[PDB]
Each structure stands twice: as structure tokens, then as C-alpha cells.
Design an enzyme around this catalytic site. Sequence first.
Site, PDB file in Angstrom:
ATOM      1  N   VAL A   1       0.850  -1.184   0.000  1.00  0.00           N
ATOM      2  CA  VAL A   1       0.000   0.000   0.000  1.00  0.00           C
ATOM      3  C   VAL A   1       0.885   1.234   0.000  1.00  0.00           C
ATOM      4  N   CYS A   2       1.438   1.570  -1.161  1.00  0.00           N
ATOM      5  CA  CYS A   2       2.380   2.677  -1.238  1.00  0.00           C
ATOM      6  C   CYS A   2       1.654   3.996  -0.998  1.00  0.00           C
ATOM      7  CB  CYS A   2       3.108   2.666  -2.587  1.00  0.00           C
ATOM      8  SG  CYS A   2       4.242   1.236  -2.853  1.00  0.00           S
ATOM      9  N   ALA A   3       2.206   4.804  -0.095  1.00  0.00           N
ATOM     10  CA  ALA A   3       1.576   6.037   0.358  1.00  0.00           C
ATOM     11  C   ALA A   3       1.685   7.163  -0.663  1.00  0.00           C
ATOM     12  CB  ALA A   3       2.202   6.496   1.671  1.00  0.00           C
TER      13      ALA A   3
ATOM     14  N   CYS B   1       5.713  -1.028  -4.727  1.00  0.00           N
ATOM     15  CA  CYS B   1       4.856  -0.426  -5.740  1.00  0.00           C
ATOM     16  C   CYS B   1       5.268   1.003  -6.069  1.00  0.00           C
ATOM     17  CB  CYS B   1       3.392  -0.452  -5.290  1.00  0.00           C
ATOM     18  SG  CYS B   1       3.116  -0.336  -3.494  1.00  0.00           S
ATOM     19  N   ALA B   2       5.847   1.719  -5.100  1.00  0.00           N
ATOM     20  CA  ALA B   2       6.168   3.134  -5.277  1.00  0.00           C
ATOM     21  C   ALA B   2       7.133   3.390  -6.432  1.00  0.00           C
ATOM     22  CB  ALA B   2       6.717   3.708  -3.971  1.00  0.00           C
TER      23      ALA B   2
END
Lengths: 163, 162, 162, 161
Positions: free
Chosen positions: D55-57, D90-91
Site C-alpha cells: 500500500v504505497c503512500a 509499488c512506489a
Amino acid sequence: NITLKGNAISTVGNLPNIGEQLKDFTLVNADLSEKTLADYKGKKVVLNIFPSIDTGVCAASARKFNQEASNLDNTVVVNVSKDLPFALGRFCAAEGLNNVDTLSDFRGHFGDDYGVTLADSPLQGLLSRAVVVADENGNVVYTEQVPEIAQEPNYDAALAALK
Amino acid sequence: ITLKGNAISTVGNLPNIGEQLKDFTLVNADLSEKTLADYKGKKVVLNIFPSIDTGVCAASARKFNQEASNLDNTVVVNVSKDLPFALGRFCAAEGLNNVDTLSDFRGHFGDDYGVTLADSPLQGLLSRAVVVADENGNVVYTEQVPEIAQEPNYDAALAALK
Amino acid sequence: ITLKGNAISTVGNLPNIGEQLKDFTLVNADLSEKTLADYKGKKVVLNIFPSIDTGVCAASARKFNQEASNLDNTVVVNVSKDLPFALGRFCAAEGLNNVDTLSDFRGHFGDDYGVTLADSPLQGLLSRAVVVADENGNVVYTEQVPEIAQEPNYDAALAALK
Amino acid sequence: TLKGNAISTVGNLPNIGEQLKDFTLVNADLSEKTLADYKGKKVVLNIFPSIDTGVCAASARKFNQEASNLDNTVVVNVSKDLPFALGRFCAAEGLNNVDTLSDFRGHFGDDYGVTLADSPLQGLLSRAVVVADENGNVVYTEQVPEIAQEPNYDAALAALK
């Protein structure tokens, strides 16, 4: 003239000739990032062209060439296939090796522009087994269209052109 | 549609309710081909993936394939751009009958169904979508998954088979 | 033993049949700790992996984990160097009871059991190996998979559990 | 601190003005990267307990887009995650000039004084950012006070500028 298990296969287009300049391309890396002909400007390049790198059957010869070619001064080995980027990491011949990229043409025109996409047979649409070597300037010095897709390329002759 | 929060777009549109399923030719893992005719007279679920080679335990997808296969005259068909060489790593079809996992690596399924991605780093892959059809072949239910990362509403899809 | 055909070596040697299992502290997927005391009086299978995060359906391991857990007073324990955050991606133990997937990322299970790889690009990971012990804790059967890629002899390993 | 309680690291993070210490980290393809691979390039050491979070911020995605776009700048993610899981960052979606490396068998965490000493996260790297110039001298560091909280990406970005 390409063949598959003895039976005749054909490729869309023709492989580059010695003396011709390398054609541009845009390929996809395993992390969905893109690589371009400009990424190899001024460096001697080996295009290692596979029907698939997701077969899981590496080879002492296939691994030994990728190790040796990378050891050469200012030289990179570039593996091209129709494999999705999600499977590019499964190429064992690039395990632990530096100066070896494994790139995907799943949405590019490498196979088209380089005349290697297969035209019939159950492998239709995949790239043919071929090796293209270019110098630091970018002109093709050596090519091979492996007559039998199963057989391995003449890695020694390819290395010799680099040497 | 969105991909990881940012907006993504697809080339085309999914088929409409009441429209007939468009033909296709997909390739199996053993380099064998499947065509829409292979499912004539059977209720069909098209499970459309950006990739089935992601490496994540498709717990929800496996639960759907088990229930859908138990249904009379029902088939689940997984479609993605993955090469036939990667289809075997889709675990959700392990041990399940009446579930095919097929490749559009050289076909036009993605264009014909309006699911191919037009931009984003996933450009060229299929979007996440579900198409259910009746035995005659008319599309009964569709889902264009709003977030490509998210899993489909498998419960609503199962209901269409019923 | 070989790794993808080339010779690899492990730091140490596997325990012998009849020896007591050496203690350890492994971390579960939810960051909790498990110890050899957690399996006292139970028949234990140590399934040692270089990684359980490879993306393969592990059909053989799922059949083993299902059968072994059906056995009375038996536990299957999967050990690897994967961080606890990736253990959830081992699908073959999904939904099965009495099958744990644990991490040695900060322990020396690999050292104490002589399975950590000493060279090769996989240096630092565990080798493919199987250790079966009884309820008292003495090793009854072991297998060091000669080729890390090949699947363990799940049939012979199961026989020791019986 | 971790979830309010105090946490500690084995060692101390490098100080501003000090040179970056060498390291050997592993890529997702089991290839090795070293400090020599970044000589003369602006480096951001993005140090994570794990990049296998899923869950990339929003702030983190914006930083990698801006920092990677910068001329002669590289972002380097270091964590204890096995290389088989580095791809789950993911970022770095579609981005160039972003490496994700593993310290599962190296001494980056020790030599950089970020490996956690206690708490359930013991053995993992702490949340930290180390920015150095082209010559290698550390210009900016941050030891994120709460491991759950995200770093101050703007102050890190300013050091690159």
C-alpha cells in the site's frame, strides 16, 4: 529459412545485415520501466533473441556465454523475448550476472523492426532464436538466425566478433 | 477506471448485456488453441487479467472457480496477455475441472472486448474485467473492475450463472 | 548437492537420525514467535525452503500438507529466510490447519540445522531439505534434496510421519 | 519509537558531513550493487523495515516521481526483504532511476546503524533517509521517530536541490 522441429517456419521481415545500423526500439524491463537504444549508446551490444526465456531449461553454454560476454570491456548482453515483464526474472542465465538486461517486446516493435517475429507454427508471434552483435558505434558486425529454434546459437562465433 | 489511484483508460468498451460473445482464438499452455466454439451451449465466465503471473495467492479467485465448476454446464476461462509459458503459474486452476487459463499474446481478444489498456505502465495488458454469458452465447453480466488492482465481485458474477 | 546443476555447499551438516531436534525461535507472518516448545509431544515435519516466495503452485507440497495434517498429532512447519511479510504468499499452506510457515530472518535455524548456503548467488538462503522427528523429538527421517529445484521425496518423508 | 514505546538501533546513523560507507546489497535478479555503482551520482538511501507492505503512500509516490526526475540523482531502497519480494515495492511503478536492494546477507544495516535491536521488528532496518552529494558526503539524514510514520520527503528533497 527457419524451421521448428524439422518443419518449416518463416519470420515476418528479415534480420539486419552486417554493416547496417541498429534500429531503435523501446522495450519493457521487469519493473515495468522502459529501455531504449539510447540506453546503450557507445557500448558494444549483444542482442540475445529468444522465443521465450520462461522455459526453465538454462544451459552451461547459454550461461557461459552471458558470463563471458559481460566480462568483455564495455559490452552488454540484452535478452529480448515476447515474455511478459512478470516472467523476465525467470531467466536463469542472468542470475547474479551484471551487464545483462532481460527485456520484453510484449508491446514494442523490436520483433517487427528486426524481422524476427515468427509467422506460423504453434510458436507464431514469438521471436525466433537469433543473435545480433553490434560495435560501439551501433553497426551490426555479426548476426545469426539459428536454423533450428530448439538448437543453441554459435556462441563462440558471436563472442569472436566482440573480441 | 483507475490503476493504483491514477486514472487509466482502455481501448474500447466491454460488450453490452444482450449482445453475443465475439469470437476469439486463445492459446493454451501446451501451445494448443481454444476458440469460442469450444464452449458452445455452456455458460461461460471470462476472467480477464492484466497478468495471471503475479505471484499472489488468488484465494478469492480459487473460491469462485470451485463454486462455478460445481454448477451444471458452466465453464470458467481465464484470459490474459501472459505467454503460454506462464499460464502454469496460475494456481487458482490447480485441481479444478472446467477451468481454462488461456493466452491472448497473439490474438485480438483484448481489442475485440475493449479491455486493452491504453496508457499507464500496464499499457498493452488487459484490464481487470469479468464477462458472464448464457448457454446460447448472449452476454448476461459484465464487470469493468474500477480499480485494476482490486479483485472482481465474484459473488455478483456467480449469481449471473445461477 | 547441486543448485541448478552447479555444485553448492551448505554451512554445516543436517542432523542425523536419532538425534534430538535443536531448539530455535522463528517468526510467524503476524510477527509472533514460535519455539521448539510449541511442538512438544507432536510429530513434526521441517520443510526447509530457499524461498516460499517464488510464485509456483507447489502442487506436491499442497498434497503433502493436506495429507500430513489429516494425521493425528502431527504438524508441518515450513522454514525459510523469507521475511514474515512474505510468508502469506506460500499458497500450499493456505487455509490448512496444523501447518505453520515461519521465518528465520533473524535466527540461526539455518546454522543450527546446517542448511544455510555458503556460496552461489543464493548464498544466505536455506537449502532444500526435509527433517522429520517423532513426538519425543528425535529425528526419524531426513532428506537433503540433491538439486534445490527438484521437489522433495514427499512420499518417503510422509512414511516417517506414519 | 514504535507504536508509542521506545525502540533502539544497533549502532548510530552516519552524521552529516561524513562519507557514505561502502556496502553490498542484492537486487531482485540476485545481482549485486555496491557503493561504487553510484559514484558521482546524488543518492537517497530510503531505508525500510519492509517494502512488502502492499500500500504505497501518496507522499511516498510523489517523492519517487520528483527525486528520480532530478538530474544526476538516484533513489536507492534498502531493506531486509528477500530479493524475491523486492518486486513488491509499488512506489517504483514504471519508474527509472529507482533501485530496490536487499540487505538479507549484507552489512548495510549494521554499517549504517539502522538495524532494530528490540521490538517485534527486531532485526529489520529502521525507517530512515540518508541523502549524500555526488562526492559521497552525507548532506541530510532522518531517523523517523515513529516507524509507522512516513519520512519528511520535502526536507530530504531539499538536500538534493
